[PDB]
Design an enzyme around this catalytic site. Structure first.
Site, PDB file in Angstrom:
ATOM      1  N   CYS B 105      -6.557  -1.033  -3.480  1.00  0.00           N
ATOM      2  CA  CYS B 105      -7.682  -1.971  -3.574  1.00  0.00           C
ATOM      3  C   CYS B 105      -9.030  -1.356  -3.190  1.00  0.00           C
ATOM      4  O   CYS B 105      -9.581  -0.560  -3.946  1.00  0.00           O
ATOM      5  CB  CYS B 105      -7.382  -3.204  -2.715  1.00  0.00           C
ATOM      6  SG  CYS B 105      -8.165  -4.738  -3.282  1.00  0.00           S
ATOM      7  N   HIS B 125      -9.781  -1.543  -6.910  1.00  0.00           N
ATOM      8  CA  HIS B 125      -9.935  -2.896  -7.392  1.00  0.00           C
ATOM      9  C   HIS B 125     -11.188  -2.816  -8.269  1.00  0.00           C
ATOM     10  O   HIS B 125     -12.104  -2.049  -7.976  1.00  0.00           O
ATOM     11  CB  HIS B 125     -10.194  -3.869  -6.244  1.00  0.00           C
ATOM     12  CG  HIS B 125     -10.333  -5.285  -6.699  1.00  0.00           C
ATOM     13  ND1 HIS B 125      -9.265  -6.153  -6.778  1.00  0.00           N
ATOM     14  CD2 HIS B 125     -11.401  -5.953  -7.193  1.00  0.00           C
ATOM     15  CE1 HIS B 125      -9.672  -7.296  -7.304  1.00  0.00           C
ATOM     16  NE2 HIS B 125     -10.964  -7.199  -7.564  1.00  0.00           N
TER      17      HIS B 125
END
EC number: 3.1.2.-
Lengths: 187, 187
Positions: B105, B125
């Site tokens: 992420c 992400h």
């Protein structure tokens, strides 16, 4: 007003099945209370992750009612939920008030233990099917997420996001579920 | 001898991205140490789940080396990891020893902060891409899991299982990863 969720956390609970629903529900704007079955002390989950509950179940119960009562899986966690008189009372009250009850993996076997939702179509982890079907009180399904009215069940760690988003859709609608889903980068 | 993993847990970390890898790695027989960046006290994650670390990073660091150093995501957690001198030293040492480093992420931005793995193909992400690419020190990928040698990255909560299983495959092999995957009921 925001919807409210009660997540009952017992020793031996599957931590992924506990955290994914709590996190996703909070992303959806749901007020979530992680309640410890044994008290307010830290809980040792199935794969040794230690989670500190927001409150004890004893205290959390007095702050009801909740729009959904969530039962995580984990064989030992489910067994502890199944043997609890407090859990029995909470589930019976929720069923009587026509409130949503959601259980995943081995979690649905606690519904059998407390004679909750007999006659419903349900799913569980494949290894928990025999226990859940003892007596033929439910009809089995292999769907990743199964919802028969107010009884929502799912199969395992890998169906946790789908399970959580089904709870979000049931409480806050399809639009909110779709909005929360996008940033998660799900398949 | 079993493989060992160090998971660095900082305030603001994404709890799903922390628990899924810890759980899955333990299912694979990997000895995992959840180390608290700030110390041995409980850590408040991004969506308020409170996790008690196995030990402080200060102490866990003295128990190295580890076969993999894992960096969970969460914007604030990643920022705390990025500002830590202790984390910088741990990552540089792991890179020098040719040990695996895994980040998910927003977690990969900590690699940028500590100048780790420049020249690698990475993913993050979508909302963390611009931060990661500041200066053009990495080549971007949209794959759910990206592995360029000893730098393994992933995109978000929804890719956590894939990320964890990629770590298991890298340490214990494809067979073990497949054995661990089956009972999870992944799509």
């Amino acid at each position: 007003a925001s919807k409210r969720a009660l997540v009952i956390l017992a020793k031996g609970a599957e931590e992924m099945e506990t955290v994914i629903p709590v996190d996703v529900m909070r992303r959806a704007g749901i007020k979530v209370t992680v309640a410890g079955l044994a008290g307010k002390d830290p809980v040792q989950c199935s794969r040794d992750v230690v989670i500190c509950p927001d409150a004890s179940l004893e205290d959390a119960k007095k702050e009801g009612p909740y729009d959904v009562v969530v039962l995580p899986g984990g064989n030992l966690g489910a067994q502890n939920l199944s043997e609890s008189a407090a859990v029995k009372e909470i589930l019976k009250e929720q069923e009587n008030r026509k409130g949503l009850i959601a259980a995943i993996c081995a979690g649905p076997t606690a519904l059998l233990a407390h004679e909750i939702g007999f006659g419903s179509k349900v799913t569980t982890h494949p290894l928990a099917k025999d226990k859940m079907m003892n007596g033929g009180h439910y009809t089995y399904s292999e769907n990743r997420v199964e919802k028969d009215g107010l009884i929502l069940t799912s199969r395992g760690p890998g169906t946790s996001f789908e399970f959580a988003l089904a709870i979000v859709e049931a409480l806050n609608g399809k639009e909110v579920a779709a909005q929360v889903k996008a940033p998660l980068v799900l398949k």
